[PDB]
Amino acid sequence: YKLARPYIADCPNCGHSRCDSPIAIEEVRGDAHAGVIRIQTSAMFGLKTDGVDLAYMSFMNGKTQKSIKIDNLHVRTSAPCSLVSHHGYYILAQCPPGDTVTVGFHDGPNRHTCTVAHKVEFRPVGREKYRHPPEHGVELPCNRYTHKRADVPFVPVKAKCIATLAPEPLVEHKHRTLILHLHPDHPTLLTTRSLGSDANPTRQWIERPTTVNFTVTGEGLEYTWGNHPPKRVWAQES
Amino acid sequence: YKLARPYIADCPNCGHSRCDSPIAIEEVRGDAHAGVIRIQTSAMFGLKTDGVDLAYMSFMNGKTQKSIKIDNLHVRTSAPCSLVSHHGYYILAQCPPGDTVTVGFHDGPNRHTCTVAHKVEFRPVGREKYRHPPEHGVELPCNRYTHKRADVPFVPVKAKCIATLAPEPLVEHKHRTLILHLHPDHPTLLTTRSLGSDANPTRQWIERPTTVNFTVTGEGLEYTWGNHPPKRVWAQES
Amino acid sequence: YKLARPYIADCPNCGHSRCDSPIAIEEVRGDAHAGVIRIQTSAMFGLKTDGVDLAYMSFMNGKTQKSIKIDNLHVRTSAPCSLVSHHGYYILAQCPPGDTVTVGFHDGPNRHTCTVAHKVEFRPVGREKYRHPPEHGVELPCNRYTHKRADVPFVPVKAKCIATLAPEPLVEHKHRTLILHLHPDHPTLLTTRSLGSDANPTRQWIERPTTVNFTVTGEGLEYTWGNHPPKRVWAQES
Amino acid sequence: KYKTKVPSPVVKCCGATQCTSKPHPDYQCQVFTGVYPFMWGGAYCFCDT
């Protein structure tokens, strides 16, 4: 169970003559290649007066610590963000980078927003760096967060998260030689090796219909064709 | 034409203010090298409850069926955008991107903004793409739409859209040689061929003050210099 | 002194198709490397009917010297902004990026708001221009302007803006030879010349850990690491 | 992947400030004396040096 409740706070960056704001954020983790972001907020969703719900928030909105259902306390990156789960002290929403999380009041003609900057390091750790999750294609290494509560925080995880792609290479096996007729509509990191004993350590980024011939040992080869983790082919002769 | 009454449609990203919103784009059609976009909204423009008007719209709000004058309800892609013609479920407006269309009320209920990501089509003319009509001289092929108030969609129609120019080519005719001192402010496709008793199949991309010498037989040459259609001399100065 | 009367002026986008605003920005000076803006408005700020004040402005809109409080007519980016000084026909304000300034009345259904996209200009002041203020480094002289008026336009001045710094040229001394391992975190201009009998006439833009070796005669050398004016070392193992 | 934490600095007006070590991985402090003169300089302080 959470040990803290929302409060009015001086924002790190808010509009001048409005910096005396309600609704604020503490820390955010966005180190994930996941589209979801784990928030430690002080403008908390997943806290009503009763604690943890999945579609309710609480805030001190220049008022007092009290709750209503999601309406006036909005997460944003700078554009809307749709929450996924609320877990008391920690909130989970998708606001992909997690370096800018904005809690803002979007009523009346005025646009009030407090935005909090965070100390996230989002780096490669996969086999390639890639686009945030869409719905389409095969995943790639990420460091997602849990998408349900346990009531205090959401836990850190490493898994694999969705990535866009285009039709996979037309492979042709022939005498000790494998041509990959490629049709990326999207930048793919192409990594190769033979899987026999031939090294072929070949990275290249490809896009557009092109061909890339590779040697084979005749004992398979891996070509990883971006937005997939290693794909491998084998045969008596490849 | 402007048959039946408006409806709502699901906004892909909206606040917690609304979501089941009016003015939620279905499609946009481009290929315009003008700043106009043809928009298909859930809400009907050019129709209020009084039937057909030219500067009023109607909308199902998902909460109310009501109409207003276009003022309080403003289209934007960052700044306000002024419509040009209404054809029921379709709007035709000046608002240059059309890739994303964000329709929001900063007067009407709460601080509503629906932003929509939806269908677009756009194409190069075959020289350089542009979407700015200035008042700089010559125009090139583009798409635009009709301004139908009666017979639902405004049909596609060819039009002429002004293109950005740059300090005009200093032509110098000389003996058997026509040097084209070119002074783009913007990337120009220089396509040439000589006229008269010669003709050169020569594409080159130009940008920044340069010279480009061409043969001429004493009978000029045509040079098309990007964002202009053919500019040709047939001089005996050559 | 200021005495150039308030006026109204057409601003490209207000309301929906509204454009009949006062308070409209005509010109901007962005000489500052900071997020402060010098604004030229049609409306006169810093003058009410009482003459010169510090927190009142005046405008026409059917008037000629009618005034309101600088909070009634409120500057904004996408959140309020508080001006700092008024120099009549010119406003100078702090508005979070200083690259988007919207002066607007969000009073009633007719919502006139003018926005001009302001700019930050970086120009040589050392031997190179420099980036916007960050956490890193310490303030240095920048291009700017006066941030208080004279009791009509604000005048240019050199003031102090936080420079992005990163490790300065890490000198490695050797036998009358200096290799300079420099480790920017930001685009820095490296200028050199020797201050020994030799000279090292080298401008180069650098980013990130690199080396640039220079000769010396055992009689010093200069490395300017742009945003500073010349830094000099003299006959160490230089 | 570390996160840099920059907390607000301990300023003593009219007296020296001494660093208190903390076991954070690359915790570094530095004591800077005479930071802010009389009145404004980045903090209001009566004392200079």
Q: Which residues contact A71 (CB under 8 A, 6 or more apart)?
A: B16, B17
Distance in angstroms (rounded) separating the CA atoms of residues B172 and B218: 13
Q: Per the structure block, which two tokens stand in for A153? A: 């925080």
What per-residue string of b and e applies to B211-221 under the rule 16 or more CB within 10 Å gives b? ebebebbebbb
Q: Tell me the chain D residues in contact with residue A125 when contact means C-beta distances shorter than 8 Å.
A: 1
Question: Which candidate from D1, D4, D5 shows the least CB-CB separation from A123?
Answer: D1
Q: Which residues contact B62 (CB under 8 A, 6 or more apart)?
A: B8, B18, B20, B21, B22
Q: Tell me the chain A residues in contact with residue B15 when contact means C-beta distances shorter than 8 Å.
A: 74, 80, 106
Chains that touch A (3 or more CB pairs under 8 A): B, C, D
Q: Tell me the chain C residues in contact with residue B73 when contact means C-beta distances shorter than 8 Å.
A: 16
Distance in angstroms (rounded) separating the CA atoms of residues B77 and B134: 20
Q: Tell me the chain B residues in contact with residue C15 when contact means C-beta distances shorter than 8 Å.
A: 71-72, 74, 80, 107
Per-residue three-class SS string for B115-181: EEECECCCCCCCCCCCCCCCCCCCEEEEEEECCCCCCCCCCEEEEEEECCCCCCCEEEEECCEEEEE
**Of C51, C57, C55, nearest in space to C22 by CA:** C57
Contact in structure between A37 and A96 (CB atoms under 8 Å): yes
Name the β-bridge partners of A191. A203, A224
Q: β-strand B100-105 against C139-145: which pairing, if any?
A: unpaired
Distance in angstroms (rounded) separating the CA atoms of residues B88 and B179: 55
Distance in angstroms (rounded) separating the CA atoms of residues A146 and A74: 21
Contact in structure between B193 and B222 (CB atoms under 8 Å): yes
**Of C27, C8, C7, nearest in space to C112 by CA:** C8
Cβ neighbours around B6 below 10 Å, total: 24
Q: Determine which of A17, A18, A105, A113 to mutate to test the interface with C (most C C-beta atoms within 10 Å).
A: A17
End-to-end alpha carbon distance in chain C? 54
| Cβ distance of B115 and A79 shorter than 8 Å | yes
Q: Can you give the C-alpha Rg of chain B in angstroms?
A: 24
Return left, alpha or beta for A12; rule: phi > 0 is left, psi -120 to 50 is alpha, else beta: alpha
Distance in angstroms (rounded) separating the CA atoms of residues C53 and C82: 15
Q: Which residues contact C206 (CB under 8 A, 6 or more apart)?
A: C182, C184, C187, C188, C189, C190, C212
Q: How far is CA D17 from CA A184, B121, B130, D9, D29, in A?
A: 60, 64, 61, 10, 11
Distance in angstroms (rounded) separating the CA atoms of residues B132 and B127: 15
Which chain C residue lies closest to A109 (C-alpha atoms)?
C106
DSSP conformational letter for D9: P
| Cβ distance of C78 and A13 shorter than 8 Å | no
Cβ neighbours around C131 below 10 Å, total: 19
Q: Which residues contact B66 (CB under 8 A, 6 or more apart)?
A: B49, B58, B59
Q: How far is C108 from chain B (nearest CA, A)?
A: 7
Cβ neighbours around C137 below 10 Å, total: 18
| Cβ distance of B74 and C106 shorter than 8 Å | no
Cα A44–Cα A48–Cα A54 angle in degrees, nearest 5? 75
Query: Strands of C170-174's sheet, edge to edge?
Result: C170-174, C177-182, C210-215
Question: Which candidate from C17, C106, C115 shows the least CB-CB separation from B82?
Answer: C17
**Long-range Cβ contacts of B206-213 (<8 Å, 24+ apart):** B206/B182, B208/B184, B209/B181, B209/B182, B209/B183, B209/B184, B210/B181, B210/B182, B211/B179, B211/B180, B211/B181, B211/B182, B212/B179, B212/B180, B212/B182, B213/B177, B213/B178, B213/B179, B213/B180
Q: How far is CA C194 from CA C124, C183, C198, in A?
A: 22, 21, 6
Query: By a Cβ cutoff of 8 Å, what residues of chain B touch chain A?
Result: 13-17, 106-107, 110-113, 115
Contact in structure between B231 and B223 (CB atoms under 8 Å): yes
Contact in structure between C125 and C142 (CB atoms under 8 Å): yes
Q: Per the structure block, which two tokens stand in for C62? A: 């059917």
Q: Taking the alpha carbons of C155, C158, C162, C166 in that order, is the dihedral positive or negative?
A: positive
Resolution of the model in angstroms: 14.1
Contact in structure between C8 and C24 (CB atoms under 8 Å): yes
Q: How far is D2 from chain A (nearest CA, A)?
A: 7
Distance in angstroms (rounded) separating the CA atoms of residues B223 and B132: 23
Q: Which residues contact B96 (CB under 8 A, 6 or more apart)?
A: B35, B36, B37, B77, B131, B132
Contact in structure between A159 and A153 (CB atoms under 8 Å): no
Distance in angstroms (rounded) separating the CA atoms of residues B154 and A150: 54
| Cβ distance of A17 and C74 shorter than 8 Å | yes
Chains B, C: CB contacts under 8 A, how many? Answer: 38
Chains that touch C (3 or more CB pairs under 8 A): A, B
Per-residue three-class SS string for A41-64: EECCECCECCECCCCCEEEECCCC
What single letter denotes the amino acid at residue B124? P
Q: Taking the alpha carbons of B43, B48, B52, B54 in that order, is the dihedral positive or negative?
A: negative
What single letter denotes the amino acid at residue A138? V
Name the β-bridge partners of C204. C190
Cα B16–Cα B21–Cα B23 angle in degrees, nearest 5? 130
Distance in angstroms (rounded) separating the CA atoms of residues B185 and B207: 7
Distance in angstroms (rounded) separating the CA atoms of residues C144 and C147: 9
Cβ neighbours around B157 below 10 Å, total: 10
Cβ neighbours around B44 below 10 Å, total: 26
**Of A92, A102, A96, A97, nearest in space to A156 by CA:** A92
Q: Which residues contact A31 (CB under 8 A, 6 or more apart)?
A: A98, A120, A121, A122, A123, A143, D1
Q: How far is B100 from chain A (nearest CA, A)?
A: 12
Question: Which candidate from A13, A17, A109 shows the least CB-CB separation from C80?
Answer: A17
Q: Is A120 on the interface with D (CB under 8 A)?
A: yes
Contact in structure between A213 and A232 (CB atoms under 8 Å): no
Question: By what technique were these coordinates determined?
Answer: cryo-EM
Question: Which candidate from B13, B107, B110 shows the least CB-CB separation from A106?
Answer: B110
Question: Which candidate from B13, B17, B113 shows the least CB-CB separation from A107?
Answer: B17
Breaks in chain C after (C-N > 2.5 angstroms):
151
Report residue B114 CA to chain centroid gap: 23
Which chain A residue lies closest to D6 (C-alpha atoms)?
A119
One-character DSSP codes across B31-92: --SSSEEEEEEEEEEEEETTEEEEEEEEEE-SS-EEEEETTSEEEESSSEE-EEEEEEEEEE
One-character DSSP codes across C110-174: S--EEEE--------SSSS------SSS-EEEEEEE-SS----PPPEEEEEEEPP-----EEEEE
Q: What are the two backbone dihedrals, phi and then psi, of residue A140, each rounded to the nearest 5 degrees?
A: -155, 155
Chains B/D: 3 or more C-beta pairs closer than 8 A? no
Q: How far is A44 from chain D (nearest CA, A)?
A: 22
| Cβ distance of A79 and B16 shorter than 8 Å | no
Distance in angstroms (rounded) separating the CA atoms of residues B231 and C93: 50
Q: How far is CA C171 from CA C137, C207, C234, D31, in A?
A: 19, 16, 12, 25
Question: Which candidate from A31, A119, A125 shows the least CB-CB separation from D5?
Answer: A119
DSSP conformational letter for A156: B
Which chain B residue lies closest to A104 (C-alpha atoms)?
B15
**Of B6, B11, B35, B15, nearest in space to B25 by CA:** B11
